[PDB]
Design a protein around this ligand. Structure first.
Ligand SMILES: [Mg+2]
Ligand SMILES: [Mg+2]
Ligand SMILES: [Mg+2]
Ligand SMILES: [Mg+2]
Ligand SMILES: [Mg+2]
Ligand SMILES: [Mg+2]
Ligand SMILES: [Mg+2]
Ligand SMILES: [Mg+2]
Lengths: 190, 51, 77, 149, 117
RNA sequence: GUUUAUUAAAAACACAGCACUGUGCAAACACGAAAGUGGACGUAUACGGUGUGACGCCUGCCCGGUGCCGGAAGGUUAAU
RNA sequence: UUGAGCCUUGAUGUGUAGGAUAGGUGGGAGGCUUUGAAGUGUGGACGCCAGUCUGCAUGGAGCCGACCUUGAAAUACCACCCUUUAAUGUUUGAUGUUCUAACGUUGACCCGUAAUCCGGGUUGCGGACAGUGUCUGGUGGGUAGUUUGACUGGGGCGGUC
């Protein structure tokens, strides 16, 4: 249809298991596959996370209520370092790198923040909404989309999630939106 | 050369092949012409086959 | 002589401009072709030496009007 | 070119359409063997006069080769003076130029071969019936009554 | 694709190698295999064994028209000349009639010379 | 035999012979913007081009280069 | 209807510590199949004959996940699909098959005609080929026009500018 028949999911149990798997160009020259910072997606969706940031011994009584469920501690920088089955996410900035707490040797979790005045700021919403989607193998954009609770109301992503069309490589044709899972399969157009 | 061999027996039963062709006229023709030397060759097939 | 009886097209002279702009006098012949035409109004084939443009003229005006021009200037066909 | 056709013409034509054909085909085959013609506009309206006439007009004239039978059921009975032998069985008998000539000869004017008395056509007295023909699809029934006078 | 059931297994047994070809009655090539095709080269392929394992491979290639009973035509000397018809019987085959077809000129062409070895 | 008519008659050119190579005939080829014509009123035991030069005894090795001949998959590649 | 654009309906992978032939990351803590399965048995079949698959079938009622390792965990399910193939298309040419009617006929015949031209006609043979026009790449000493320096103890060589 002109946009999408957002009525394209009439059996699993809760068909929210949908994804933003669009198409981009090719690498004939020099371009890359990246995502900004926690792409929220203009839609409340309904996602409560357990966002893991690396603050300190003060950010445990207000740097944990803002679309999350905890924050790594000061004793647990390497005192959570004794297992592979034991242990979004984060890494504060400014002049602070975090290879001493995420480095060598297979998981992605970059976006948390960087504040020199607050742990939960007066106006800072947008983190715990939607995931990332960097480079993969034959393209990019993998993640999540709408749900079994909307209609054409999760097609708020349709005009500001497919509209994330940043400069295409060179010798390509980036443009094709698709989603779905747990019933059939498909997508309309761009 | 040919064997019908109908129903009961999966044994080849072609011992006929050792009754003519094979290394018979086929080892014969396989190589060096000969021409007159078979004469000599067969003059032993009888210088022997006398006894 | 290479002339189209419909249009009068005939060979014209000009140049062959090389890559270095050297001009050598040449010609342009027309795309002539003798062609048999069924005149219904004459129960007869009239064959004209015509250029391709010639034909297209005949396909539009119609062999009757066209012969009618040849006739009207003693271009006998 | 465009060219408008004459006869039916195979995988393209119709009988009087405005198809579009490669000029090689138009000259050299079609128009010469007059199966079509240049769509010289002058012509395409030569054909518009030919799009009103014979069709719109002479099919409500076969609505008269049809409403002849609106006067086939509004009388629905002619009698023939044909008697009876030894028990009300026709001493006469009536066919097509009897049921078309004893149809014409009143206010019911039919063409003599427009009266289908399937045979009975005919061999007894009293009421019978017949199939009256004016059009290919629209005929009409009556009732015939051979009167023994 | 297609089907037969009544067939013919042609074999070309010759000192350097032996070749199995399996075709219908009207010999239109249904499947083949060679002693080289399988492996073994040099001595190697010129062996009854190597001919067994070609006779075999050939089945997994002509079973692809579900053949049931088939005659056997045996050409040339060299191993694989009979060891092939063994691996054929077993392969899963009613084996109809056997014939030997090795050609025999009534003395025509002068054959090669030499083999001062 | 021919040749530099007028400073060269020769070992130069031609020559029978030989070899390559083109040409199926509306031949190749040649003279012709073209029509037309030679080739030929011939037809591969023919016709053209090229070289070699009676005859005798013979004519080896090299296809990298340059010419030519064949090739079709890739690569490159015109107007459009 | 053959070789290319490309798009729905599907495949698929022997680097070590291991229940064992991990494509890269992503939705993911329960879908489903009685719309009638796991693999026994042969059917098309890709082939490194190491193994995979299903329209169908003999079948006939559960298997599993963070489990303990590994730079990367589920053949639990789904797809945007890359390592590279395979089954209709759309038309479009394309290689293709005929046809005849443009066009060729330097076959035969008829008439103008007491004519080896030419024209018209009839026939036979070809046939949208061949050929020609315009455009276009290649080739092209066959033709053509030119260029091919100066200094210099003559010039040339050498050297120099
Ligand atoms: Mg002399
Ligand atoms: Mg002199
Ligand atoms: Mg002198
Ligand atoms: Mg010659
Ligand atoms: Mg000489
Ligand atoms: Mg030599
Ligand atoms: Mg010159
Ligand atoms: Mg000088």
């Amino acid at each position: 249809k002109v946009y999408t028949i957002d009525e394209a999911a009439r059996t699993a149990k809760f068909d929210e298991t949908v994804e933003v798997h669009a198409k981009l160009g090719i690498d004939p020259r020099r371009s890359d596959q990246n995502v900004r910072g926690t792409v929220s997606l203009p839609h409340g969706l309904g996602k409560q996370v357990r966002v893991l940031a690396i603050a300190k011994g003060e950010k445990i009584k207000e740097a944990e209520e803002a679309g999350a469920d905890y924050v790594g501690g000061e004793e647990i920088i390497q005192k959570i370092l004794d297992g592979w089955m034991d242990f979004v996410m984060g890494a504060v900035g400014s002049k602070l790198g975090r290879i001493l707490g995420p480095r060598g040797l297979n998981p992605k979790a970059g976006t948390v923040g960087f504040n020199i005045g607050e742990i939960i700021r007066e106006i800072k919403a947008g983190r715990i909404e939607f995931r990332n989607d960097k480079t993969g193998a034959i393209h990019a954009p993998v993640g999540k989309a709408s749900f079994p609770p909307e209609k054409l109301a999760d097609n708020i992503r349709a005009f500001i999630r497919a509209l994330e069309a940043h400069k295409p490589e060179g010798a390509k044709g980036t443009f094709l939106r698709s989603v779905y899972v747990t019933t059939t399969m498909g997508p309309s157009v761009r | 050369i040919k064997v019908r061999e109908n129903e009961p027996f999966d044994v080849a039963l072609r011992r006929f092949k050792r009754s003519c062709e094979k290394a018979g006229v086929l080892a014969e023709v396989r190589r060096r012409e000969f021409y007159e030397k078979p004469t000599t060759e067969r003059k032993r097939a009888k210088a022997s086959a006398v006894k | 002589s290479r002339v189209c009886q419909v249009t009068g097209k005939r060979p014209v002279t000009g140049n062959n401009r090389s890559h270095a702009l050297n001009a050598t006098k040449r010609r342009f012949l027309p795309n002539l072709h003798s062609h048999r035409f069924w005149v219904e109004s004459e129960k007869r084939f009239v064959t004209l030496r015509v250029s391709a443009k010639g034909m297209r003229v005949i396909d539009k005006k119609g062999i009757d009007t066209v012969l009618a021009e040849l006739r009207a200037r003693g271009e006998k066909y | 070119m465009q060219v408008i056709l004459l006869d039916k013409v195979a995988n393209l034509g119709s009988l009087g359409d405005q198809v579009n054909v490669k000029a090689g085909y138009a000259r050299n085959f079609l128009v010469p063997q007059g199966k079509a013609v240049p769509a010289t506009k002058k012509n395409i309206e030569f054909f518009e006069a030919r799009r009103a006439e014979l069709e719109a007009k002479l099919a409500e004239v076969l609505a008269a080769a049809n409403a002849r039978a609106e006067k086939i059921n509004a009388l629905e009975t002619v009698t023939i003076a044909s008697k009876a032998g030894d028990e009300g069985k026709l001493f006469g008998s009536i066919g097509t130029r009897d049921i078309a000539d004893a149809v014409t000869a009143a206010g019911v004017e039919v063409a003599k071969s427009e009266v289908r008395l399937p045979n009975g056509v005919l061999r007894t007295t009293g009421e019978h019936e017949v199939s009256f023909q004016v059009h290919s699809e629209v005929f009409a029934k009556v009732i015939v009554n051979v009167v023994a006078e | 694709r297609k089907q037969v059931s009544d067939g013919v297994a042609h074999i070309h047994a010759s000192f350097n190698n032996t070749i199995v070809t399996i075709t219908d009655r009207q010999g239109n090539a249904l499947g083949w295999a060679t002693a080289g095709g399988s492996g073994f080269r040099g001595s190697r392929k010129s062996t009854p064994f190597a001919a067994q394992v070609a006779a075999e491979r050939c089945a997994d290639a002509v079973k692809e028209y579900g053949i049931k009973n088939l005659e056997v035509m045996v050409k040339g000397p060299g191993p694989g000349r009979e060891s092939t018809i063994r691996a054929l019987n077993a392969a899963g085959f009613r084996i109809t009639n056997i014939t030997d077809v090795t050609p025999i000129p009534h003395n025509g062409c002068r054959p090669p010379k030499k083999r001062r070895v």
